[PDB]
CSV table of C-alpha atoms in Angstrom, one decimal:
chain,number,residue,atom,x,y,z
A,1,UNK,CA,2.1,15.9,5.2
A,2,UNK,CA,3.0,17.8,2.3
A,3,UNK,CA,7.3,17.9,1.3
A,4,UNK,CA,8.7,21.7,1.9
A,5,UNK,CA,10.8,22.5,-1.4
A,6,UNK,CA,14.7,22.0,-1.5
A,7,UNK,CA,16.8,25.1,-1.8
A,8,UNK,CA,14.3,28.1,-1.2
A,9,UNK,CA,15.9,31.1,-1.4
A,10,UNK,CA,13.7,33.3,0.8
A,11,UNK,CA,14.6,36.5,0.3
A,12,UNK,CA,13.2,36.1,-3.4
A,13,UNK,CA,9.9,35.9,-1.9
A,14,UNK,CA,9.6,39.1,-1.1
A,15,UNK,CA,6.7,41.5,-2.4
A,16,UNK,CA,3.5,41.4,-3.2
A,17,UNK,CA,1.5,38.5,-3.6
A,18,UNK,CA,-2.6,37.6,-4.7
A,19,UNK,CA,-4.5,34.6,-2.8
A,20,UNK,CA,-5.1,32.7,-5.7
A,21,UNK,CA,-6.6,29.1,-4.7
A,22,UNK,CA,-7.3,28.0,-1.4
A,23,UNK,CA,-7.8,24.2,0.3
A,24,UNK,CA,-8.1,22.7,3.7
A,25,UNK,CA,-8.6,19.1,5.3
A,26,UNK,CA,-12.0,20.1,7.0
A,27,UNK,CA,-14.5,22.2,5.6
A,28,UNK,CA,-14.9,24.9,8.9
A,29,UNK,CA,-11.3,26.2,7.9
A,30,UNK,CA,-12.3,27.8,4.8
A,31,UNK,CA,-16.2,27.5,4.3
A,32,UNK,CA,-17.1,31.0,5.1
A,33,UNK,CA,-15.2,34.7,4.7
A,34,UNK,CA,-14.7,34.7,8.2
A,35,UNK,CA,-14.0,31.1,8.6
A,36,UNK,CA,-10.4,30.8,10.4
A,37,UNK,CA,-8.2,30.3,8.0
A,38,UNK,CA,-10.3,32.4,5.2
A,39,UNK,CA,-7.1,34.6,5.1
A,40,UNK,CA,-5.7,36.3,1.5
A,41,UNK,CA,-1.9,36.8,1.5
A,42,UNK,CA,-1.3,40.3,0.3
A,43,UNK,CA,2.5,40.5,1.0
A,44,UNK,CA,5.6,38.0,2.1
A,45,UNK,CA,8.2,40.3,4.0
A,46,UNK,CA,11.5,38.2,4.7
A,47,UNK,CA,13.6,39.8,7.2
A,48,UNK,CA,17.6,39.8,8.0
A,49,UNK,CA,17.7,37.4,10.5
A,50,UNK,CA,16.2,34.3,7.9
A,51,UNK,CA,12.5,34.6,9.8
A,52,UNK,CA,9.0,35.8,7.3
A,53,UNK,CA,6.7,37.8,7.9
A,54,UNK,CA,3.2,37.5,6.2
A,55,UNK,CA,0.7,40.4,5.8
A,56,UNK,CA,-2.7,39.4,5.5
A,57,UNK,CA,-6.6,40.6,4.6
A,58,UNK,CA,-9.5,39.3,6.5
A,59,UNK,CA,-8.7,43.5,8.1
A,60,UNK,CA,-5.3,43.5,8.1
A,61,UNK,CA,-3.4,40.4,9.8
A,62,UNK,CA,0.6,40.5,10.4
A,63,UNK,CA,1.8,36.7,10.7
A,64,UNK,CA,5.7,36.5,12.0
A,65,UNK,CA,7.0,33.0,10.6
A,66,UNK,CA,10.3,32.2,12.3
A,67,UNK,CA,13.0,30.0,11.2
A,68,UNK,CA,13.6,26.2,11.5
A,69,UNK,CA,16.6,23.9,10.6
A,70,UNK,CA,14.5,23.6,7.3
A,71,UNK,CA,15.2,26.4,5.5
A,72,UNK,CA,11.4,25.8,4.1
A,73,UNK,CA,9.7,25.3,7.6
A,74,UNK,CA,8.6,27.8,9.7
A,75,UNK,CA,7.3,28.3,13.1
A,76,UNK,CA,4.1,30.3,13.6
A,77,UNK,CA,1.2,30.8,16.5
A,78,UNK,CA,-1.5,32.4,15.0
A,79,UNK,CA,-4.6,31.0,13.5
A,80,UNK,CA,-5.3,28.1,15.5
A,81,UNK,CA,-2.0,26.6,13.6
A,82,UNK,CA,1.9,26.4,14.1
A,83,UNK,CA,4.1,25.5,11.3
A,84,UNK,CA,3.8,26.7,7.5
A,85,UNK,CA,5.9,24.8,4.7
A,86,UNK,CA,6.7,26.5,1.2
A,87,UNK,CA,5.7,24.1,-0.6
A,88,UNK,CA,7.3,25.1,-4.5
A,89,UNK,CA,8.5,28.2,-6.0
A,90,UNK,CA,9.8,30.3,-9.2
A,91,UNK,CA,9.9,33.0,-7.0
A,92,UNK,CA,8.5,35.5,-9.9
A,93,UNK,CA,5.0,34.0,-10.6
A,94,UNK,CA,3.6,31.1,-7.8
A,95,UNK,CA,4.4,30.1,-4.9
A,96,UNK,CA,2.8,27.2,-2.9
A,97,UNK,CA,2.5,26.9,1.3
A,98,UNK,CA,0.9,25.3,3.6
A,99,UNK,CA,-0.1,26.0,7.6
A,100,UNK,CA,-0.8,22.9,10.1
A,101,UNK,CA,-0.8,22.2,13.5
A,102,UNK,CA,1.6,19.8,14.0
A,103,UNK,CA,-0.3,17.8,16.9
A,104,UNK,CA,-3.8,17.9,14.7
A,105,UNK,CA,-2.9,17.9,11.1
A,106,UNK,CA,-6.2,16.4,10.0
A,107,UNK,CA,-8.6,18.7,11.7
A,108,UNK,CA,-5.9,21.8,10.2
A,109,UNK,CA,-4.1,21.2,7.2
A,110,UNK,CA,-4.9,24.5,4.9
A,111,UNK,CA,-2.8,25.5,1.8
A,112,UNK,CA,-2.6,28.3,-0.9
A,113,UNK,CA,-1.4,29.1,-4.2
A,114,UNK,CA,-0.4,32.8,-4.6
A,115,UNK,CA,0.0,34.5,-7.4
A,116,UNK,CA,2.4,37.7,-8.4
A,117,UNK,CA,-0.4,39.4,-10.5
A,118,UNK,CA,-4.1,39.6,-10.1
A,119,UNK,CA,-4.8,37.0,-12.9
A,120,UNK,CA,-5.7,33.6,-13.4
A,121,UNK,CA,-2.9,31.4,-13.5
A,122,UNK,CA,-4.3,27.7,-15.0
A,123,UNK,CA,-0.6,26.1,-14.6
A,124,UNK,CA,0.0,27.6,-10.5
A,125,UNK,CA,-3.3,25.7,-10.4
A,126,UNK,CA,-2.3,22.9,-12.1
A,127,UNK,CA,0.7,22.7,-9.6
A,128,UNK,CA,-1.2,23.5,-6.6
A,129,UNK,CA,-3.7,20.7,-7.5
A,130,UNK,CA,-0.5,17.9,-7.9
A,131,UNK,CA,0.8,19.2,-4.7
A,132,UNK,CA,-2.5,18.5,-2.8
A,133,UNK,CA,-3.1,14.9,-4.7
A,134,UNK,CA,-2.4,12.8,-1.9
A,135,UNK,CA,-3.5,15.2,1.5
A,136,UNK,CA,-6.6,14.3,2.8
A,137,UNK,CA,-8.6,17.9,1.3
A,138,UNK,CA,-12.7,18.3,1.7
A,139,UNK,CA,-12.7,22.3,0.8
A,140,UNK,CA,-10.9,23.9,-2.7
A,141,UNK,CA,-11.8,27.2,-3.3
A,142,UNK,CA,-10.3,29.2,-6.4
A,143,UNK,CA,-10.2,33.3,-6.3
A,144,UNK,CA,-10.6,36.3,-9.2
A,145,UNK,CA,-7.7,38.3,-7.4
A,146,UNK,CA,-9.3,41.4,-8.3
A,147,UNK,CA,-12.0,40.9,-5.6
A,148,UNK,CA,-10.0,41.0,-2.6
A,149,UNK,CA,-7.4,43.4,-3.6
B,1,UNK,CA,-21.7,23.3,-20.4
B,2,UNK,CA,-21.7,19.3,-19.2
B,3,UNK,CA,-22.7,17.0,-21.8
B,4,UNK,CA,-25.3,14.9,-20.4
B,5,UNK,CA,-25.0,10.6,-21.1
B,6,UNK,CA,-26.5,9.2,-24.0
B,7,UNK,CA,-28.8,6.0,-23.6
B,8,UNK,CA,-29.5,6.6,-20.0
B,9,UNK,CA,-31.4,3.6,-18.4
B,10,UNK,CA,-33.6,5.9,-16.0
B,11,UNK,CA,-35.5,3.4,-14.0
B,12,UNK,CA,-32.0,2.2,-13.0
B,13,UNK,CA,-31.0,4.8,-11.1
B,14,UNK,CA,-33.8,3.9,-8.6
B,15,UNK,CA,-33.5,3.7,-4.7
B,16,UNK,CA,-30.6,5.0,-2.2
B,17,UNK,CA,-27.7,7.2,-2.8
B,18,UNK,CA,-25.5,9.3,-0.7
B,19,UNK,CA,-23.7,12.9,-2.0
B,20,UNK,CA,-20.0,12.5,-1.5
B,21,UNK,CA,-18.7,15.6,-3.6
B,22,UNK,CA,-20.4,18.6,-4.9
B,23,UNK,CA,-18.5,21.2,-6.6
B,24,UNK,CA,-20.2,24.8,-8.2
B,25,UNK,CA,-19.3,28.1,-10.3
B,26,UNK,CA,-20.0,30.3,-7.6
B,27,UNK,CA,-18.5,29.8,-4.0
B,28,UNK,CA,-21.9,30.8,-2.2
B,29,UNK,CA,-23.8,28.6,-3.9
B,30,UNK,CA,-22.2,25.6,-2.1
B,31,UNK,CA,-20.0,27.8,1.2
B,32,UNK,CA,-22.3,27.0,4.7
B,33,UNK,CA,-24.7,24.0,5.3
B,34,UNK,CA,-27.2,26.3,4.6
B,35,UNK,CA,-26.3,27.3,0.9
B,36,UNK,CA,-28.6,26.9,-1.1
B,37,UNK,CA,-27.0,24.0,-3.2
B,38,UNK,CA,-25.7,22.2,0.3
B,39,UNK,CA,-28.2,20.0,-0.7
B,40,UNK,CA,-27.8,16.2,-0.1
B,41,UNK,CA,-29.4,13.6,-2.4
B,42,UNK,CA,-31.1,10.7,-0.5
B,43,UNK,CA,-33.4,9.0,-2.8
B,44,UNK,CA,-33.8,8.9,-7.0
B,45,UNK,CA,-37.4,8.0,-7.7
B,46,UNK,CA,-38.1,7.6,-11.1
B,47,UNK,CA,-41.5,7.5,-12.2
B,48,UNK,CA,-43.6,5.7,-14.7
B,49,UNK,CA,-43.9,8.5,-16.9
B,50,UNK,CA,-39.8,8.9,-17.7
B,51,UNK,CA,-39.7,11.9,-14.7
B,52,UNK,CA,-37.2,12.3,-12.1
B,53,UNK,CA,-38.5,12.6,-8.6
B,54,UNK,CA,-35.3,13.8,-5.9
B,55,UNK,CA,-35.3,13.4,-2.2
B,56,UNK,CA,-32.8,15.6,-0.5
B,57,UNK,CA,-32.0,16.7,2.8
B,58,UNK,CA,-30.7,19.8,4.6
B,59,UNK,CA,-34.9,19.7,6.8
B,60,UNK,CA,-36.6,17.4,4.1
B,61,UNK,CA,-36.9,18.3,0.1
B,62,UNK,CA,-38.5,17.0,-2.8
B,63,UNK,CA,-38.1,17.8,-6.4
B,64,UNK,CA,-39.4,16.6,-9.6
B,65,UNK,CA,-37.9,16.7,-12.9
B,66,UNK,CA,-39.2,16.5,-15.4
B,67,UNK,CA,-38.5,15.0,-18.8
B,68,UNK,CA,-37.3,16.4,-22.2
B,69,UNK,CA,-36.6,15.1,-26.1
B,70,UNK,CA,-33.4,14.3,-24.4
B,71,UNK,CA,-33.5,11.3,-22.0
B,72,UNK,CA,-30.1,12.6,-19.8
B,73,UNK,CA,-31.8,16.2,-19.0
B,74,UNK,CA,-34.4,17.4,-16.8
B,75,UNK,CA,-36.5,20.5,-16.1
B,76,UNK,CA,-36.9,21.4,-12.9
B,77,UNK,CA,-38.5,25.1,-10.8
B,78,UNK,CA,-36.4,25.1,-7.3
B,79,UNK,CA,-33.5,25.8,-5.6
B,80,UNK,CA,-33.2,28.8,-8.6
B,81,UNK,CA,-32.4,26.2,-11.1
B,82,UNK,CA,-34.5,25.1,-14.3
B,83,UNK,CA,-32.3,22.0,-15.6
B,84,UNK,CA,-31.0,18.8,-14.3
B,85,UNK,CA,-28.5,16.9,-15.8
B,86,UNK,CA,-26.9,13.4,-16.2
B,87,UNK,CA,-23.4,13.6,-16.6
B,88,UNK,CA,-22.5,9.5,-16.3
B,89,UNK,CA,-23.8,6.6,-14.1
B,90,UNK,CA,-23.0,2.9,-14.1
B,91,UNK,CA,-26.2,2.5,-11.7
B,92,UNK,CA,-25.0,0.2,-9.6
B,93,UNK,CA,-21.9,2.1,-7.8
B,94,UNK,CA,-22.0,5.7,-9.2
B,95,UNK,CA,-23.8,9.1,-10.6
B,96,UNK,CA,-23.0,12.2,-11.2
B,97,UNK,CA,-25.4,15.2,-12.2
B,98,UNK,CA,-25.6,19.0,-12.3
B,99,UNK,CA,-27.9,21.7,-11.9
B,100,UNK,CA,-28.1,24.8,-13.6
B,101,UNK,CA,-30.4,28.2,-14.6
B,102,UNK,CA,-30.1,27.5,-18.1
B,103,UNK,CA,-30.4,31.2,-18.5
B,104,UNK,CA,-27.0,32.3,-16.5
B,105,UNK,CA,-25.2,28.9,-15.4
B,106,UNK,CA,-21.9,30.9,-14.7
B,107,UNK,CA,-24.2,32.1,-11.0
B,108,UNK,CA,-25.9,28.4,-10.9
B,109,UNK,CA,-23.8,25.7,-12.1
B,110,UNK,CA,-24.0,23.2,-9.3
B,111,UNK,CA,-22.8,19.7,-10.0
B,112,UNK,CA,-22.7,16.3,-7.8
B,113,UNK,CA,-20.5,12.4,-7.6
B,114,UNK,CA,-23.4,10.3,-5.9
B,115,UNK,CA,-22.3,7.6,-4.5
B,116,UNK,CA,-24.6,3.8,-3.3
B,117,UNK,CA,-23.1,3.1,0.0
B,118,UNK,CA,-21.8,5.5,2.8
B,119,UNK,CA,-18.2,4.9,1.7
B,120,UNK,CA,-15.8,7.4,0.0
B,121,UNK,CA,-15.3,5.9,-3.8
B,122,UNK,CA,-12.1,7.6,-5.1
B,123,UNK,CA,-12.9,6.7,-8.4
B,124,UNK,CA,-16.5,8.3,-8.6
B,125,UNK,CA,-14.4,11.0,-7.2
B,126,UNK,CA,-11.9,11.0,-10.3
B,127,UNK,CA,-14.4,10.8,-12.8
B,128,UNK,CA,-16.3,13.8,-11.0
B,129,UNK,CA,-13.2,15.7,-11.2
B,130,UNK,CA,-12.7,14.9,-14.8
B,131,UNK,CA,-16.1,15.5,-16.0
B,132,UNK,CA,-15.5,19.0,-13.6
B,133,UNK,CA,-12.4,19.9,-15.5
B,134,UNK,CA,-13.1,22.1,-18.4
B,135,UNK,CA,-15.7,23.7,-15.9
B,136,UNK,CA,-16.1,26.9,-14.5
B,137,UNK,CA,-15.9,25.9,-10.8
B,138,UNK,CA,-14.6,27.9,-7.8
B,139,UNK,CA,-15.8,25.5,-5.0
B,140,UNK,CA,-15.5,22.2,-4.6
B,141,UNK,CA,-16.3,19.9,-1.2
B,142,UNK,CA,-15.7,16.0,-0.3
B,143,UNK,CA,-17.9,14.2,2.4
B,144,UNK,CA,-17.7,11.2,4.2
B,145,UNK,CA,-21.1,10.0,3.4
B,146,UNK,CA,-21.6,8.7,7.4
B,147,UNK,CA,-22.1,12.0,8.6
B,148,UNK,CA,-25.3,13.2,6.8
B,149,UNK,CA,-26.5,9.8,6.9
């Protein structure tokens, strides 16, 4: 399992945001367009209470991500999975997650990097490749932005 | 553009291998186990003449290629590709390759880390990844070499 960052300060996630890389632990995840967890993140929408909510293309997809004792951790049930972790942060260009199932983390493991704008970003790559170094990944799929959006 | 080895020792790339990692420029290319570069190498069959015969599964597939002035690059009429490459090999552990349509590799480029036994070799998978890095890829999959087999 992936570390969640230290100090997230979710309400600077807000906005919109581009799928920019995508990789999961089995291949089915992610091997199609309409493969489960095939999804492009199109905006993060933090609410009062410390809970996120994640709007999402497929078709639109509304994810509510409710808070843990780790203010990085949150609880979902959607997508075959029930936990996402932000993994890293600046808040104004990339941001890193992953989504698990917490009993089956093998057979469910999936991670992005999003992007702020629809461009290329070599370095949030960069990061997103350290982050998955040591998770157990068969799929990596990298996005033009402009496509989906 | 890969550049291919120099002084490859063709005949020793005889006999067995397994596909543990193929990676490509174009996510369809490689997306569904019926892309049409999900193709998995089982045999190398060099033949007297300096030519390159490949047996692949995906449903049984044969390919030759066939030599040029340069001993690391093949040509080849299948799978929409013309040319096959040699990126590296020690022969007795490792190889990797790629295919590409010499005439638009940015829809075709399609490259492979063969490995000799059905185990997953993480440094065949480093030096794919390295040889992959300047690359234009946007897909890239692990196996465990067991399951095709």
């Amino acid at each position: 399992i992936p570390q969640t960052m230290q100090d997230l300060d979710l309400q600077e996630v807000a906005g919109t945001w581009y799928s920019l890389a995508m990789a999961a632990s089995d291949i089915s995840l992610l091997d199609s367009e309409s493969a489960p967890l095939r999804v492009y993140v199109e905006e993060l929408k933090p609410t009062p209470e410390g809970d996120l909510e994640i709007l999402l293309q497929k078709a639109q997809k509304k994810i509510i991500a409710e808070k843990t004792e780790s203010p990085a951790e949150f609880k979902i049930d959607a997508l075959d999975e029930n936990k996402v972790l932000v993994l890293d942060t600046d808040y104004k260009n990339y941001l890193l997650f992953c989504m698990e199932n917490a009993a089956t983390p093998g057979q469910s493991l999936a991670c992005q990097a999003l992007v702020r704008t629809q461009m290329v970003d070599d370095e949030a790559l960069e990061k997103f490749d350290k982050a998955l170094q040591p998770l157990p990944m068969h799929i990596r799929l990298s996005f033009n932005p402009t496509r989906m959006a």
